[PDB]
């Protein structure tokens, strides 16, 4: 997406966008990072 | 805090404070529509939301354009005219196709204030393929230029325009392409409160026909209203009356369905399950639907349509075990009301997928039971995504689901219009269930005669008294106590009052050219003494150019006569069949008529008939009053008998049979109590006699049946 | 520093038929000299 302050309403907003499906805070695990494409292996802690 | 209105007006035009200053609304003169968005929200961020058009672009300065309607940027078989850049209100365009083409639909069409086309797609077909040619909807673009079987074909949009309907149509065998005819909406071209109750009625009441067959009506309604904060009290409240409406008008058929009301936001809010004794009670679930509040979802003011369908879901479920007595039999219609814009559980969708993997359908190629389910979609938010709403809506021939009206107001009187309004609701050319009798309409005419006699030949019931079928089985002679007439498979024989002939038949009005037998307007009408009550073994036929008619061809009611006949007998082969008797049991036996370019080749050949051997033009044998069928090209059809004369020819459309011919005579008997020829001539033709010439005797015969005859 | 027509404006051509104006015309305006004339309006391709 982006980058001036991203306050609290900011992400709300943003974060309930009609394009938006999945909201999750996860915790890279294992980086298995390639040439073409690199795969984050992510643990949804919520 | 209210957000800044800076740089947020339009030009040429101006806007309005809604909600105390968290929405605004732009208002552009008539004859000018906002752009892009018709509404903004006050994010709380500080600034409105940004300008998204239809292609999620972004746009800087808002800008009050004309009503435009949708450019014919594709186009097929014919031409269009004139052309230009952009169409204003009120202009007109024609279409012409090429030399060998037929021109089906609307030839003139006129943009409407409503930015849409007036009258119907104009489509140029050649009748080469298995199914009609799809056409090319104003605004679309099909890719496939075959219409054999099992092809399919697929559309596209202009950029800026939401696809409604099928992107994707498949020719299923019987003629018939799946899903239903795609159309580029915009973002101002809504829908008139008439264009939505015409639409919407057209396509429940006839999922409500087939029903009847068959307390407790074995069809579910359920009922799932949105309460989420971003459509306001103002347009739920409103859509709270219009469902109260509905209720009452589905009261109005004398029907008792099962209901289910839910309100969902956040999480579903079960009010009434269709599992209650009191679901089929439609006071009680009116009253509960005047319970509910606006102010019930303020707390968790959520969108979460996913759940709201898992929560029907769950209604029409069932433990298993059960496997449920009749499960197979139930219809079911949901109707929700939703601004599209949801944002949490991700896509409705995938529920409306597990629903008919429940009701398993769509997952049998021979039995698609497509009939068991409707899902009308119905906008209500200040800003509805028509995208979503047709996802989830149903995509049926010749029928709509998706509603988008122009406010509030104007959806309440689409059902305001329906209370009032009877819709003729006749069930000619039905089948019940489906031991095996799926012909009420077949009827078996005996005449016994001195020394044998015999005459064995058939007719079609076409109302609660008259029995079409052909003349020459009878004679002058021949009285009322000598003609015996069975129906439904009954042993015992129907009293006949009179039999009416034609006042142009005359099969012995040729002999002085020596032509011995001239089956012109060989048909013949049969009054019987009793009323019929219909039953699921008895039932009558749709006749050509009635109001019963129209809705089995799904067509509008201000349907001319001349429509229905381009509808059923078009200018090329068409798929029609008859019922035949074999071994005592009833079959059917799949033809097509000769009405293309194959016509003169299948009449020519009646000269190889018996004493048509020596007749000078062969054109004044066979009169414009018939249909000629049977043959080898394209396919090798099945030729009727001695029995099966006066026989129905009926065309099976839109799971409905319509009688377009009477069985008159065949070139070369192929039945001789014994066997069938195998050996047949490739000029062996069957003829038969076209109701669409007939029409005036029929009209006046059958004034007083309730069919309801188009004028013309 | 900017001018020209927007790009959102341009309606592109489209209509490349190889072969077109398929249909049929009958003479049967006043004949003089023995020779009718037809004036036809079309509109050619792009
Ligand atoms: C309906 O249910 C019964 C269950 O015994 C089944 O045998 C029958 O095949 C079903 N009917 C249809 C339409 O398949």
Not at chain 2, 36 to 44: D, F, K
Not at chain 2, 164 to 189: A, H, K, L, V, Y
Not at chain 2, 673 to 690: E, L, S, T
Request: hydrophobic share 30%; glycine share 8%; with cysteine.
């Amino acid at each position: 997406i982006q980058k001036d302050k991203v306050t609290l309403e900011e992400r709300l907003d943003k974060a309930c966008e009609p394009g938006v499906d999945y909201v999750y805070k996860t915790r890279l695990v294992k980086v298995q990072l390639s040439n073409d494409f690199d795969e984050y292996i992510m643990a949804i802690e919520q | 805090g209210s957000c800044s209105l800076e740089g947020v007006e339009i030009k040429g035009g101006s806007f309005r404070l809604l909600q105390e200053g968290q929405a605004l609304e732009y208002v552009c003169p008539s004859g000018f529509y906002p752009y892009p968005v018709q509404t903004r929200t006050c994010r709380s961020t500080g600034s409105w939301s940004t300008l998204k058009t239809q292609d999620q672009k972004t746009v800087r300065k808002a800008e009050c354009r004309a009503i435009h309607c949708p450019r014919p940027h594709d186009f097929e078989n014919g031409e269009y005219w004139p052309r230009s850049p952009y169409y204003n209100v009120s202009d007109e365009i024609s279409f012409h196709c090429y030399d060998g083409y037929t021109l089906r639909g609307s030839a003139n069409r006129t943009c409407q204030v409503n930015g849409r086309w007036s009258g119907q797609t104009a489509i140029c077909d050649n009748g080469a393929g298995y199914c009609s040619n799809p056409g090319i909807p104003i605004g679309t673009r099909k890719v496939g230029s075959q219409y054999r079987l099992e092809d399919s074909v697929t559309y596209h949009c202009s950029r800026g325009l939401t696809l409604r309907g099928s992107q994707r149509r498949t020719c299923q065998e019987g003629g018939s392409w799946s899903g239903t005819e795609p159309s580029c909406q915009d973002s101002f071209m809504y829908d008139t409160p008439q264009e939505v109750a015409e639409a919407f009625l057209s396509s429940l009441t006839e999922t409500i026909e087939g029903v009847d067959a068959e307390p407790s009506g074995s069809m579910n309604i359920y009922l799932v209203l949105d309460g989420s904060g971003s459509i306001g009290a103002s347009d739920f409240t409103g859509a709270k009356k219009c469902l109260v409406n509905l209720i009452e008008k589905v009261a109005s058929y004398g029907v008792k369905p099962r209901y289910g009301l839910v309100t969902y936001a956040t999480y579903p809010k079960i009010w009434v399950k269709v599992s209650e004794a009191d679901s089929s009670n439609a006071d009680w679930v009116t009253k509960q639907l005047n319970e509910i509040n606006y102010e019930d979802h303020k707390l968790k003011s959520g969108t979460n349509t996913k759940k709201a369908l898992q929560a029907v879901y769950s209604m029409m479920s069932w433990p298993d075990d059960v496997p449920p007595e009749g499960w197979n039999r139930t219809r079911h219609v949901i109707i929700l009301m939703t601004d599209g814009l949801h944002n949490m559980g991700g896509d409705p969708i995938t529920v409306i997928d597990e629903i008919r993997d429940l009701l398993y359908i769509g997952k049998d190629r021979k039995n698609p039971r497509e009939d068991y389910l409707d899902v009308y979609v119905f906008g209500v938010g200040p800003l509805v995504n028509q995208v979503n709403i047709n996802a989830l809506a149903s995509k049926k021939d010749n029928e709509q689901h998706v509603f988008k009206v122009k406010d509030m107001e104007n959806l309440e009187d689409v059902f305001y219009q329906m209370i009032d309004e009877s819709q003729s609701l006749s069930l000619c050319g039905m089948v019940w269930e489906h031991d095996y009798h799926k012909q009420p309409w077949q009827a078996k005419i005996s005449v016994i005669r001195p020394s044998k006699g015999h005459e064995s030949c058939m007719g079609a019931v076409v109302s609660e008294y008259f029995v079409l079928t052909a003349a020459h089985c009878f004679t002058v002679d021949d009285k009322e106590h000598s003609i015996k007439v069975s129906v439904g498979g009954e042993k015992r024989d129907l009293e006949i009052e009179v039999v009416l002939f034609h006042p142009n038949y005359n099969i012995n009005g040729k002999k002085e050219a020596g032509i011995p037998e001239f089956y012109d307007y060989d048909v013949a009408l049969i009054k019987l003494k009793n009323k019929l009550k219909y039953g699921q073994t008895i039932r009558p036929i749709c006749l050509p150019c009635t109001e019963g008619t129209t809705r089995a061809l799904r067509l509008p009611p201000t349907t001319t006569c001349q429509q229905q006949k381009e509808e059923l007998l078009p200018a090329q082969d068409i798929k029609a069949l008859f019922v035949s008797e074999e071994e005592k049991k009833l079959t059917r036996k799949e033809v097509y008529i000769k009405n293309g370019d194959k016509k003169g080749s299948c009449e020519r050949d009646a000269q190889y008939a018996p004493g048509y051997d020596k007749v000078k033009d062969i054109s004044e044998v066979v009169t414009p009053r018939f249909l000629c069928t049977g043959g080898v090209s394209p396919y090798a059809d099945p030729n009727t008998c001695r029995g099966d004369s006066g026989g129905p020819l009926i065309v099976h459309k839109r799971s409905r049979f319509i009688q377009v011919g009477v069985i008159s005579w065949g070139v070369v008997d192929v039945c001789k109590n014994q066997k069938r020829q195998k050996q047949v001539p490739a000029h062996a033709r069957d003829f038969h006699i076209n109701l669409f010439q007939v029409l005036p005797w029929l009209k006046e015969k059958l004034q007083d049946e309730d069919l309801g005859f188009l004028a013309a | 520093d900017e001018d020209i027509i927007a790009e959102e404006n341009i309606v592109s051509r489209s209509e490349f038929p190889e072969s077109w104006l398929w249909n049929v015309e009958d003479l049967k305006e006043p004949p003089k000299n023995g020779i009718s004339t037809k004036l036809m309006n079309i509109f050619l391709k792009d």
